[PDB]
Amino acid sequence: REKRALLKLAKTPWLGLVVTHFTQALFVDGYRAEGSKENAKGPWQTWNANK
Amino acid sequence: TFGAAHNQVLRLAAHVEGDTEGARDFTASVSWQDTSVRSLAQAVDAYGKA
Amino acid sequence: ATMLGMPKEFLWGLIPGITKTDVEAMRQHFNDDDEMTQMLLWWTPNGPGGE
Amino acid sequence: ATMLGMPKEFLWGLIPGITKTDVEAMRQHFNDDDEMTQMLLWWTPNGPGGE
What span, in angstroms and rounded, lies between the C-alpha atoms of D48 and B16? Predict the structure, then answer.
């Protein structure tokens, strides 16, 4: 109960940090067809309407 | 990988709401924002030169 | 491209940050008749050029 | 703005030290008929230009 507190002190969320670091960089900004600069109306409206 | 999954999701959603063309359009794909770590000045200079 | 005279279209794909899908999108919408596209295609440093 | 031809009004907001209220103030008083404003709008390096 005195070394157990030390053990709980040394625990650091490194794996959570890795997951958060990789999550913050993955973002989708558009859904475009092949050879088109515009977003597809239907699928992108569905994407936005579902937040 | 996640873009393949997202395209699957969006094609399924198009199939649910009719949209026969969108459901079978496997060529369309999602677009991801840039993950490169580069300064603004370098990127702008390079793209302007390009 | 400026000196050796290489085809610029082939050199688009070698630039980092641009994928082949983006290259195809540029190829399809390079000569659009939209006023904005025409102004950007004929963009001199001191404003639009061309016609 | 010079090369890629981006709209300069949108690029005003991205410059540090300028807020959106200042951007609105610049927008409203960009084309004032005051002689000082007109001279600053047509300012060549060797003094005022324009009319």
Answer: 64
